[PDB]
PDB file of N, CA and C in Angstrom:
ATOM      1  N   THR A  50       4.748 -68.981  39.347  1.00  0.00           N
ATOM      2  CA  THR A  50       3.989 -69.620  38.467  1.00  0.00           C
ATOM      3  C   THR A  50       3.294 -68.312  37.472  1.00  0.00           C
ATOM      4  N   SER A  51       3.164 -66.907  37.518  1.00  0.00           N
ATOM      5  CA  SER A  51       2.704 -66.114  36.786  1.00  0.00           C
ATOM      6  C   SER A  51       3.769 -65.220  36.689  1.00  0.00           C
ATOM      7  N   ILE A  52       3.966 -64.529  35.516  1.00  0.00           N
ATOM      8  CA  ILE A  52       4.856 -63.239  35.370  1.00  0.00           C
ATOM      9  C   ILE A  52       4.159 -62.426  34.902  1.00  0.00           C
ATOM     10  N   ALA A  53       3.964 -60.999  35.183  1.00  0.00           N
ATOM     11  CA  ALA A  53       3.271 -59.711  34.603  1.00  0.00           C
ATOM     12  C   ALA A  53       3.899 -58.667  34.524  1.00  0.00           C
ATOM     13  N   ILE A  54       4.645 -58.185  33.553  1.00  0.00           N
ATOM     14  CA  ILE A  54       5.036 -57.228  32.830  1.00  0.00           C
ATOM     15  C   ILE A  54       4.053 -56.193  32.540  1.00  0.00           C
ATOM     16  N   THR A  55       4.188 -54.826  33.613  1.00  0.00           N
ATOM     17  CA  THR A  55       3.248 -54.011  32.675  1.00  0.00           C
ATOM     18  C   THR A  55       3.941 -52.377  32.733  1.00  0.00           C
ATOM     19  N   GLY A  56       3.793 -51.870  32.050  1.00  0.00           N
ATOM     20  CA  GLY A  56       4.050 -50.553  31.918  1.00  0.00           C
ATOM     21  C   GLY A  56       3.287 -49.406  32.810  1.00  0.00           C
ATOM     22  N   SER A  57       4.002 -48.453  33.283  1.00  0.00           N
ATOM     23  CA  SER A  57       3.498 -47.351  33.980  1.00  0.00           C
ATOM     24  C   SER A  57       4.452 -46.053  33.894  1.00  0.00           C
ATOM     25  N   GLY A  58       4.053 -45.102  34.470  1.00  0.00           N
ATOM     26  CA  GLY A  58       4.810 -43.893  34.465  1.00  0.00           C
ATOM     27  C   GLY A  58       4.566 -43.059  33.196  1.00  0.00           C
ATOM     28  N   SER A  59       5.815 -43.436  32.639  1.00  0.00           N
ATOM     29  CA  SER A  59       6.302 -42.727  31.200  1.00  0.00           C
ATOM     30  C   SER A  59       5.410 -43.777  30.008  1.00  0.00           C
ATOM     31  N   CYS A  60       5.135 -44.955  30.237  1.00  0.00           N
ATOM     32  CA  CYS A  60       4.969 -46.069  29.408  1.00  0.00           C
ATOM     33  C   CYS A  60       3.351 -46.841  29.905  1.00  0.00           C
ATOM     34  N   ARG A  61       2.430 -45.509  29.786  1.00  0.00           N
ATOM     35  CA  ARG A  61       1.314 -45.681  30.253  1.00  0.00           C
ATOM     36  C   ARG A  61       0.436 -46.612  29.330  1.00  0.00           C
ATOM     37  N   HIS A  62       0.580 -45.957  27.969  1.00  0.00           N
ATOM     38  CA  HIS A  62      -0.105 -46.340  26.778  1.00  0.00           C
ATOM     39  C   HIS A  62       0.690 -47.830  26.390  1.00  0.00           C
ATOM     40  N   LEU A  63       1.552 -48.576  27.395  1.00  0.00           N
ATOM     41  CA  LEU A  63       2.198 -49.618  26.820  1.00  0.00           C
ATOM     42  C   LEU A  63       2.015 -50.799  28.066  1.00  0.00           C
ATOM     43  N   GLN A  64       1.420 -52.364  27.562  1.00  0.00           N
ATOM     44  CA  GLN A  64       1.646 -53.361  28.199  1.00  0.00           C
ATOM     45  C   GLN A  64       2.618 -54.371  27.512  1.00  0.00           C
ATOM     46  N   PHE A  65       3.242 -54.807  28.235  1.00  0.00           N
ATOM     47  CA  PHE A  65       4.517 -55.595  27.491  1.00  0.00           C
ATOM     48  C   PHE A  65       4.436 -56.928  27.709  1.00  0.00           C
ATOM     49  N   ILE A  66       3.355 -57.417  28.985  1.00  0.00           N
ATOM     50  CA  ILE A  66       3.033 -58.916  29.001  1.00  0.00           C
ATOM     51  C   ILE A  66       1.978 -59.309  27.938  1.00  0.00           C
ATOM     52  N   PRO A  67       2.181 -60.419  27.456  1.00  0.00           N
ATOM     53  CA  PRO A  67       1.230 -61.077  26.145  1.00  0.00           C
ATOM     54  C   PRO A  67       0.155 -61.492  26.555  1.00  0.00           C
ATOM     55  N   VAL A  68      -1.139 -61.056  27.157  1.00  0.00           N
ATOM     56  CA  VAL A  68      -1.973 -61.561  27.573  1.00  0.00           C
ATOM     57  C   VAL A  68      -3.225 -61.869  26.284  1.00  0.00           C
ATOM     58  N   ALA A  69      -2.925 -61.617  25.415  1.00  0.00           N
ATOM     59  CA  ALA A  69      -3.488 -61.255  23.786  1.00  0.00           C
ATOM     60  C   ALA A  69      -5.058 -60.547  24.175  1.00  0.00           C
ATOM     61  N   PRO A  70      -5.030 -59.621  24.339  1.00  0.00           N
ATOM     62  CA  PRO A  70      -6.023 -58.437  24.592  1.00  0.00           C
ATOM     63  C   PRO A  70      -6.549 -57.881  23.311  1.00  0.00           C
ATOM     64  N   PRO A  71      -7.568 -58.327  23.056  1.00  0.00           N
ATOM     65  CA  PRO A  71      -8.471 -57.766  22.044  1.00  0.00           C
ATOM     66  C   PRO A  71      -9.039 -56.821  22.014  1.00  0.00           C
ATOM     67  N   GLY A  72      -8.913 -55.593  23.164  1.00  0.00           N
ATOM     68  CA  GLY A  72      -9.558 -54.489  23.597  1.00  0.00           C
ATOM     69  C   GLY A  72      -9.166 -53.517  22.468  1.00  0.00           C
ATOM     70  N   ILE A  73     -10.468 -53.100  21.603  1.00  0.00           N
ATOM     71  CA  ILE A  73     -10.228 -52.147  20.868  1.00  0.00           C
ATOM     72  C   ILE A  73     -11.461 -50.710  21.676  1.00  0.00           C
ATOM     73  N   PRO A  74     -11.086 -49.391  21.940  1.00  0.00           N
ATOM     74  CA  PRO A  74     -11.619 -48.172  22.358  1.00  0.00           C
ATOM     75  C   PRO A  74     -12.107 -47.591  21.139  1.00  0.00           C
ATOM     76  N   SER A  75     -12.720 -47.189  21.682  1.00  0.00           N
ATOM     77  CA  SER A  75     -13.979 -46.442  20.829  1.00  0.00           C
ATOM     78  C   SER A  75     -13.389 -45.068  20.341  1.00  0.00           C
ATOM     79  N   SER A  76     -14.431 -44.520  19.885  1.00  0.00           N
ATOM     80  CA  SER A  76     -13.650 -42.740  19.253  1.00  0.00           C
ATOM     81  C   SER A  76     -14.614 -41.647  19.914  1.00  0.00           C
ATOM     82  N   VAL A  77     -14.366 -40.687  20.581  1.00  0.00           N
ATOM     83  CA  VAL A  77     -14.476 -39.555  20.921  1.00  0.00           C
ATOM     84  C   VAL A  77     -15.871 -39.055  20.447  1.00  0.00           C
ATOM     85  N   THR A  78     -17.125 -39.049  20.907  1.00  0.00           N
ATOM     86  CA  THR A  78     -17.979 -37.936  20.007  1.00  0.00           C
ATOM     87  C   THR A  78     -17.650 -36.916  19.686  1.00  0.00           C
ATOM     88  N   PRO A  79     -17.905 -36.115  18.647  1.00  0.00           N
ATOM     89  CA  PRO A  79     -17.536 -34.881  17.788  1.00  0.00           C
ATOM     90  C   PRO A  79     -18.348 -34.025  18.715  1.00  0.00           C
ATOM     91  N   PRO A  80     -18.366 -33.225  19.979  1.00  0.00           N
ATOM     92  CA  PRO A  80     -19.332 -32.245  20.392  1.00  0.00           C
ATOM     93  C   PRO A  80     -19.518 -30.956  19.457  1.00  0.00           C
ATOM     94  N   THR A  81     -20.987 -30.559  19.644  1.00  0.00           N
ATOM     95  CA  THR A  81     -21.091 -29.663  18.425  1.00  0.00           C
ATOM     96  C   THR A  81     -20.616 -27.826  19.465  1.00  0.00           C
ATOM     97  N   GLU A  82     -19.490 -27.269  18.323  1.00  0.00           N
ATOM     98  CA  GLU A  82     -19.469 -26.313  19.272  1.00  0.00           C
ATOM     99  C   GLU A  82     -20.351 -24.706  19.254  1.00  0.00           C
ATOM    100  N   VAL A  83     -20.244 -24.333  20.616  1.00  0.00           N
ATOM    101  CA  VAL A  83     -21.230 -23.697  20.538  1.00  0.00           C
ATOM    102  C   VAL A  83     -20.934 -22.001  20.984  1.00  0.00           C
ATOM    103  N   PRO A  84     -20.557 -21.608  20.186  1.00  0.00           N
ATOM    104  CA  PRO A  84     -19.742 -20.104  20.157  1.00  0.00           C
ATOM    105  C   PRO A  84     -21.082 -18.921  20.484  1.00  0.00           C
ATOM    106  N   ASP A  85     -21.124 -18.201  21.442  1.00  0.00           N
ATOM    107  CA  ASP A  85     -21.956 -17.272  21.707  1.00  0.00           C
ATOM    108  C   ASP A  85     -21.486 -15.563  21.615  1.00  0.00           C
ATOM    109  N   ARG A  86     -22.574 -14.887  20.671  1.00  0.00           N
ATOM    110  CA  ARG A  86     -22.637 -13.924  19.985  1.00  0.00           C
ATOM    111  C   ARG A  86     -23.720 -13.340  20.645  1.00  0.00           C
ATOM    112  N   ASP A  87     -23.074 -12.185  20.654  1.00  0.00           N
ATOM    113  CA  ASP A  87     -24.571 -10.895  21.507  1.00  0.00           C
ATOM    114  C   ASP A  87     -24.098  -9.172  20.781  1.00  0.00           C
ATOM    115  N   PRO A  88     -24.948  -9.734  19.697  1.00  0.00           N
ATOM    116  CA  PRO A  88     -24.504  -8.287  18.989  1.00  0.00           C
ATOM    117  C   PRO A  88     -25.775  -7.291  19.192  1.00  0.00           C
ATOM    118  N   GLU A  89     -25.805  -5.749  19.212  1.00  0.00           N
ATOM    119  CA  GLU A  89     -26.524  -5.075  19.771  1.00  0.00           C
ATOM    120  C   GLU A  89     -27.963  -5.060  18.730  1.00  0.00           C
ATOM    121  N   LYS A  90     -29.033  -4.756  19.231  1.00  0.00           N
ATOM    122  CA  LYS A  90     -30.153  -4.649  18.494  1.00  0.00           C
ATOM    123  C   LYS A  90     -31.134  -3.212  18.826  1.00  0.00           C
ATOM    124  N   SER A  91     -31.620  -2.730  17.355  1.00  0.00           N
ATOM    125  CA  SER A  91     -32.599  -2.029  17.536  1.00  0.00           C
ATOM    126  C   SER A  91     -33.814  -2.223  18.334  1.00  0.00           C
ATOM    127  N   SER A  92     -34.735  -1.899  19.301  1.00  0.00           N
ATOM    128  CA  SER A  92     -35.878  -2.121  19.102  1.00  0.00           C
ATOM    129  C   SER A  92     -36.569  -2.559  18.363  1.00  0.00           C
ATOM    130  N   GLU A  93     -37.595  -4.040  18.659  1.00  0.00           N
ATOM    131  CA  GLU A  93     -38.412  -4.579  18.116  1.00  0.00           C
ATOM    132  C   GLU A  93     -39.701  -3.852  18.057  1.00  0.00           C
ATOM    133  N   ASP A  94     -39.490  -2.430  19.012  1.00  0.00           N
ATOM    134  CA  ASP A  94     -40.664  -1.703  19.545  1.00  0.00           C
ATOM    135  C   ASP A  94     -41.092  -1.176  18.349  1.00  0.00           C
ATOM    136  N   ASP A  95     -39.895  -0.533  17.171  1.00  0.00           N
ATOM    137  CA  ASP A  95     -40.085   0.063  16.016  1.00  0.00           C
ATOM    138  C   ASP A  95     -41.249  -0.743  15.586  1.00  0.00           C
ATOM    139  N   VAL A  96     -41.360  -1.776  15.520  1.00  0.00           N
ATOM    140  CA  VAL A  96     -42.458  -2.415  14.835  1.00  0.00           C
ATOM    141  C   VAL A  96     -44.087  -1.819  14.891  1.00  0.00           C
ATOM    142  N   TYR A  97     -44.192  -1.857  16.140  1.00  0.00           N
ATOM    143  CA  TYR A  97     -45.264  -1.242  16.896  1.00  0.00           C
ATOM    144  C   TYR A  97     -45.465   0.090  16.859  1.00  0.00           C
TER     145      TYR A  97
ATOM    146  N   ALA B  50     -47.721  21.085  23.823  1.00  0.00           N
ATOM    147  CA  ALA B  50     -46.248  21.257  24.355  1.00  0.00           C
ATOM    148  C   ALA B  50     -46.167  20.402  25.415  1.00  0.00           C
ATOM    149  N   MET B  51     -46.933  20.720  26.159  1.00  0.00           N
ATOM    150  CA  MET B  51     -46.365  18.800  27.388  1.00  0.00           C
ATOM    151  C   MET B  51     -45.869  17.855  26.779  1.00  0.00           C
ATOM    152  N   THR B  52     -46.355  17.422  25.892  1.00  0.00           N
ATOM    153  CA  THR B  52     -45.398  15.914  25.348  1.00  0.00           C
ATOM    154  C   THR B  52     -44.764  16.364  24.486  1.00  0.00           C
ATOM    155  N   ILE B  53     -44.402  17.691  23.912  1.00  0.00           N
ATOM    156  CA  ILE B  53     -42.997  17.865  23.391  1.00  0.00           C
ATOM    157  C   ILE B  53     -41.781  17.824  24.083  1.00  0.00           C
ATOM    158  N   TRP B  54     -42.563  18.266  25.594  1.00  0.00           N
ATOM    159  CA  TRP B  54     -41.548  18.556  26.644  1.00  0.00           C
ATOM    160  C   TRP B  54     -40.857  17.249  26.967  1.00  0.00           C
ATOM    161  N   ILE B  55     -42.033  16.106  27.234  1.00  0.00           N
ATOM    162  CA  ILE B  55     -41.565  15.125  27.562  1.00  0.00           C
ATOM    163  C   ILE B  55     -40.500  14.609  26.269  1.00  0.00           C
ATOM    164  N   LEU B  56     -40.870  14.507  25.083  1.00  0.00           N
ATOM    165  CA  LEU B  56     -40.207  13.892  24.231  1.00  0.00           C
ATOM    166  C   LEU B  56     -38.873  15.035  24.017  1.00  0.00           C
ATOM    167  N   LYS B  57     -38.512  15.883  24.758  1.00  0.00           N
ATOM    168  CA  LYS B  57     -36.977  16.872  24.922  1.00  0.00           C
ATOM    169  C   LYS B  57     -36.396  16.429  25.721  1.00  0.00           C
ATOM    170  N   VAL B  58     -37.204  16.157  26.968  1.00  0.00           N
ATOM    171  CA  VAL B  58     -36.598  15.797  28.319  1.00  0.00           C
ATOM    172  C   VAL B  58     -35.902  14.171  28.383  1.00  0.00           C
ATOM    173  N   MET B  59     -36.778  13.402  28.156  1.00  0.00           N
ATOM    174  CA  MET B  59     -36.320  11.874  27.496  1.00  0.00           C
ATOM    175  C   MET B  59     -36.051  11.212  26.565  1.00  0.00           C
ATOM    176  N   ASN B  60     -35.990  12.402  25.534  1.00  0.00           N
ATOM    177  CA  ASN B  60     -35.392  12.098  23.710  1.00  0.00           C
ATOM    178  C   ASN B  60     -35.847  11.134  23.510  1.00  0.00           C
ATOM    179  N   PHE B  61     -37.003  10.701  23.357  1.00  0.00           N
ATOM    180  CA  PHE B  61     -37.623   9.926  23.035  1.00  0.00           C
ATOM    181  C   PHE B  61     -37.394   9.486  21.385  1.00  0.00           C
ATOM    182  N   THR B  62     -36.456   8.790  20.855  1.00  0.00           N
ATOM    183  CA  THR B  62     -36.417   8.643  19.368  1.00  0.00           C
ATOM    184  C   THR B  62     -36.793   7.659  18.677  1.00  0.00           C
ATOM    185  N   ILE B  63     -36.586   7.100  17.647  1.00  0.00           N
ATOM    186  CA  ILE B  63     -37.115   6.183  16.716  1.00  0.00           C
ATOM    187  C   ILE B  63     -37.363   4.879  17.230  1.00  0.00           C
ATOM    188  N   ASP B  64     -36.175   4.544  18.379  1.00  0.00           N
ATOM    189  CA  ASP B  64     -35.597   3.109  18.987  1.00  0.00           C
ATOM    190  C   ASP B  64     -35.816   3.167  20.396  1.00  0.00           C
ATOM    191  N   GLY B  65     -36.870   3.939  21.143  1.00  0.00           N
ATOM    192  CA  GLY B  65     -36.648   3.897  22.594  1.00  0.00           C
ATOM    193  C   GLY B  65     -36.004   4.979  23.135  1.00  0.00           C
ATOM    194  N   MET B  66     -35.701   5.049  24.473  1.00  0.00           N
ATOM    195  CA  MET B  66     -35.677   5.834  25.353  1.00  0.00           C
ATOM    196  C   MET B  66     -33.854   6.414  25.105  1.00  0.00           C
ATOM    197  N   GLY B  67     -33.651   6.830  23.564  1.00  0.00           N
ATOM    198  CA  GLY B  67     -32.076   7.040  23.588  1.00  0.00           C
ATOM    199  C   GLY B  67     -31.520   5.483  22.922  1.00  0.00           C
ATOM    200  N   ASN B  68     -30.087   5.669  23.618  1.00  0.00           N
ATOM    201  CA  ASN B  68     -29.424   4.319  23.813  1.00  0.00           C
ATOM    202  C   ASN B  68     -30.262   3.498  24.534  1.00  0.00           C
ATOM    203  N   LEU B  69     -30.352   3.696  25.762  1.00  0.00           N
ATOM    204  CA  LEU B  69     -31.413   2.428  26.749  1.00  0.00           C
ATOM    205  C   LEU B  69     -32.502   1.850  26.103  1.00  0.00           C
ATOM    206  N   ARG B  70     -32.946   0.559  26.352  1.00  0.00           N
ATOM    207  CA  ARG B  70     -34.005   0.306  25.862  1.00  0.00           C
ATOM    208  C   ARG B  70     -34.463  -0.607  27.377  1.00  0.00           C
ATOM    209  N   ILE B  71     -35.618  -1.254  27.302  1.00  0.00           N
ATOM    210  CA  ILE B  71     -36.285  -1.317  28.055  1.00  0.00           C
ATOM    211  C   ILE B  71     -37.038  -3.029  27.761  1.00  0.00           C
ATOM    212  N   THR B  72     -36.735  -4.228  28.110  1.00  0.00           N
ATOM    213  CA  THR B  72     -36.901  -5.169  27.684  1.00  0.00           C
ATOM    214  C   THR B  72     -37.884  -6.381  29.076  1.00  0.00           C
ATOM    215  N   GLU B  73     -38.261  -7.391  28.380  1.00  0.00           N
ATOM    216  CA  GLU B  73     -38.803  -8.616  29.688  1.00  0.00           C
ATOM    217  C   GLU B  73     -37.984  -8.656  30.564  1.00  0.00           C
ATOM    218  N   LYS B  74     -36.636  -8.852  30.788  1.00  0.00           N
ATOM    219  CA  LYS B  74     -35.661  -9.271  31.677  1.00  0.00           C
ATOM    220  C   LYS B  74     -35.257  -7.799  32.388  1.00  0.00           C
ATOM    221  N   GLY B  75     -35.252  -6.988  31.891  1.00  0.00           N
ATOM    222  CA  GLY B  75     -34.821  -5.533  32.395  1.00  0.00           C
ATOM    223  C   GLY B  75     -34.017  -4.723  31.581  1.00  0.00           C
ATOM    224  N   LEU B  76     -33.384  -3.781  31.921  1.00  0.00           N
ATOM    225  CA  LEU B  76     -32.646  -2.636  31.387  1.00  0.00           C
ATOM    226  C   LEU B  76     -31.633  -3.130  30.349  1.00  0.00           C
ATOM    227  N   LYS B  77     -31.599  -2.804  29.351  1.00  0.00           N
ATOM    228  CA  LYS B  77     -30.212  -2.959  28.406  1.00  0.00           C
ATOM    229  C   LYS B  77     -29.708  -1.641  27.821  1.00  0.00           C
ATOM    230  N   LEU B  78     -28.685  -1.667  28.159  1.00  0.00           N
ATOM    231  CA  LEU B  78     -27.721  -0.233  28.179  1.00  0.00           C
ATOM    232  C   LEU B  78     -26.904   0.020  26.850  1.00  0.00           C
ATOM    233  N   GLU B  79     -27.453   0.417  26.013  1.00  0.00           N
ATOM    234  CA  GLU B  79     -26.604   0.929  24.680  1.00  0.00           C
ATOM    235  C   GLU B  79     -25.756   2.027  24.693  1.00  0.00           C
ATOM    236  N   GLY B  80     -25.308   2.382  25.886  1.00  0.00           N
ATOM    237  CA  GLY B  80     -24.749   3.679  26.007  1.00  0.00           C
ATOM    238  C   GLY B  80     -23.906   3.399  27.544  1.00  0.00           C
ATOM    239  N   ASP B  81     -22.742   4.074  27.506  1.00  0.00           N
ATOM    240  CA  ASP B  81     -21.904   4.406  29.129  1.00  0.00           C
ATOM    241  C   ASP B  81     -23.041   4.810  30.142  1.00  0.00           C
ATOM    242  N   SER B  82     -22.551   4.381  31.165  1.00  0.00           N
ATOM    243  CA  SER B  82     -23.338   4.923  32.331  1.00  0.00           C
ATOM    244  C   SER B  82     -22.796   5.302  33.318  1.00  0.00           C
ATOM    245  N   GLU B  83     -21.972   6.675  33.852  1.00  0.00           N
ATOM    246  CA  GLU B  83     -21.655   7.364  34.677  1.00  0.00           C
ATOM    247  C   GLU B  83     -22.571   7.846  35.658  1.00  0.00           C
ATOM    248  N   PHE B  84     -22.501   7.470  36.878  1.00  0.00           N
ATOM    249  CA  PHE B  84     -23.389   7.778  38.222  1.00  0.00           C
ATOM    250  C   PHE B  84     -22.878   8.828  39.070  1.00  0.00           C
ATOM    251  N   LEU B  85     -23.417   9.927  39.482  1.00  0.00           N
ATOM    252  CA  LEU B  85     -22.524  10.891  40.545  1.00  0.00           C
ATOM    253  C   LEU B  85     -22.633  10.233  41.773  1.00  0.00           C
ATOM    254  N   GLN B  86     -24.124   9.508  42.213  1.00  0.00           N
ATOM    255  CA  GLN B  86     -24.325   9.314  43.877  1.00  0.00           C
ATOM    256  C   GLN B  86     -23.771   7.776  43.785  1.00  0.00           C
ATOM    257  N   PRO B  87     -23.848   7.266  44.608  1.00  0.00           N
ATOM    258  CA  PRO B  87     -23.046   5.893  44.756  1.00  0.00           C
ATOM    259  C   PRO B  87     -24.300   4.807  44.866  1.00  0.00           C
ATOM    260  N   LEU B  88     -24.011   3.759  43.779  1.00  0.00           N
ATOM    261  CA  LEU B  88     -24.627   2.710  43.422  1.00  0.00           C
ATOM    262  C   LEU B  88     -25.290   1.625  44.587  1.00  0.00           C
ATOM    263  N   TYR B  89     -25.709   0.527  44.054  1.00  0.00           N
ATOM    264  CA  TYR B  89     -26.084  -0.568  45.393  1.00  0.00           C
ATOM    265  C   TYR B  89     -26.266  -1.510  44.200  1.00  0.00           C
ATOM    266  N   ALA B  90     -26.212  -2.691  44.633  1.00  0.00           N
ATOM    267  CA  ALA B  90     -25.643  -4.106  43.835  1.00  0.00           C
ATOM    268  C   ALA B  90     -26.199  -5.218  44.888  1.00  0.00           C
ATOM    269  N   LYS B  91     -26.734  -6.346  44.436  1.00  0.00           N
ATOM    270  CA  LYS B  91     -26.570  -7.377  44.993  1.00  0.00           C
ATOM    271  C   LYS B  91     -25.701  -8.877  44.304  1.00  0.00           C
ATOM    272  N   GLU B  92     -25.735  -8.860  43.429  1.00  0.00           N
ATOM    273  CA  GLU B  92     -24.429  -9.565  42.656  1.00  0.00           C
ATOM    274  C   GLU B  92     -24.013  -9.227  41.250  1.00  0.00           C
ATOM    275  N   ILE B  93     -22.657  -9.494  41.216  1.00  0.00           N
ATOM    276  CA  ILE B  93     -22.168  -9.141  39.688  1.00  0.00           C
ATOM    277  C   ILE B  93     -21.793 -10.703  39.039  1.00  0.00           C
ATOM    278  N   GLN B  94     -22.306 -11.014  38.140  1.00  0.00           N
ATOM    279  CA  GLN B  94     -22.042 -12.193  37.890  1.00  0.00           C
ATOM    280  C   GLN B  94     -22.030 -12.114  36.273  1.00  0.00           C
ATOM    281  N   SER B  95     -20.691 -12.276  35.741  1.00  0.00           N
ATOM    282  CA  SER B  95     -20.532 -11.616  34.555  1.00  0.00           C
ATOM    283  C   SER B  95     -20.848 -12.998  33.719  1.00  0.00           C
ATOM    284  N   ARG B  96     -21.000 -12.787  32.396  1.00  0.00           N
ATOM    285  CA  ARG B  96     -21.286 -14.194  31.622  1.00  0.00           C
ATOM    286  C   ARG B  96     -20.043 -15.337  31.030  1.00  0.00           C
ATOM    287  N   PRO B  97     -20.089 -16.152  31.131  1.00  0.00           N
ATOM    288  CA  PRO B  97     -18.970 -17.131  30.855  1.00  0.00           C
ATOM    289  C   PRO B  97     -18.791 -16.864  29.807  1.00  0.00           C
TER     290      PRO B  97
END
């Protein structure tokens, strides 16, 4: 009745049975890079 | 004379108790720290 030839293993990104798939995946949102910097400080008590 | 003795003992420079500083969270040590007697601790959780 039906034949479904599908990829796997090293063919993960490949499907070979034409089902007419219109699937268009979205794009990964760019996350803001958050580098952490801890330089030394002179005392803010110098102000007082 | 007594206050100058305090300033000489604790080395009250312009920026606090020498390199040691005291803030809201707790001690911030801008110098090395070698202790003669055994210390104690509760956790040591280094920052990521």
